């Protein structure tokens, strides 16, 4: 869980064809971290995201 990882996830979502904002991307990142149930680890399951 790092800002670089958040930027990479946002870029991947943009490449997928979606339009995302900073708040929405941050909320997705926090929700992914919550789903992994680990403070410093975000969920790598990109299908669910």
């Amino acid at each position: 869980a790092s800002p670089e990882n958040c930027t990479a996830l946002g870029g991947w979502l943009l490449a997928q064809g979606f339009q995302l904002t900073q708040g929405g991307l941050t909320r997705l990142y926090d929700e992914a971290r919550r789903m992994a149930e680990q403070r410093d680890r975000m969920d790598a399951r990109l299908v669910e995201i």
Partner: protein, 48 residues
């Protein structure tokens, strides 16, 4: 021979001590998924 092949690939065909050490480290780290998961679990406290 497989380890020497990996060391040559990582060192551009030359088996230096650095190349062989890097090859050994990469071989160990390739099979480190379970170790990484266990270590991050114990660091978070999932397994105390």
């Amino acid at each position: 021979r497989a380890l020497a092949e990996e060391a040559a690939v990582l060192g551009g065909g030359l088996l230096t001590a650095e190349s062989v050490e890097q090859a050994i480290a990469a071989r160990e780290h390739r099979s480190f998924l379970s170790e990484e998961e266990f270590l991050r679990a114990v660091q978070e406290g999932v397994i105390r």
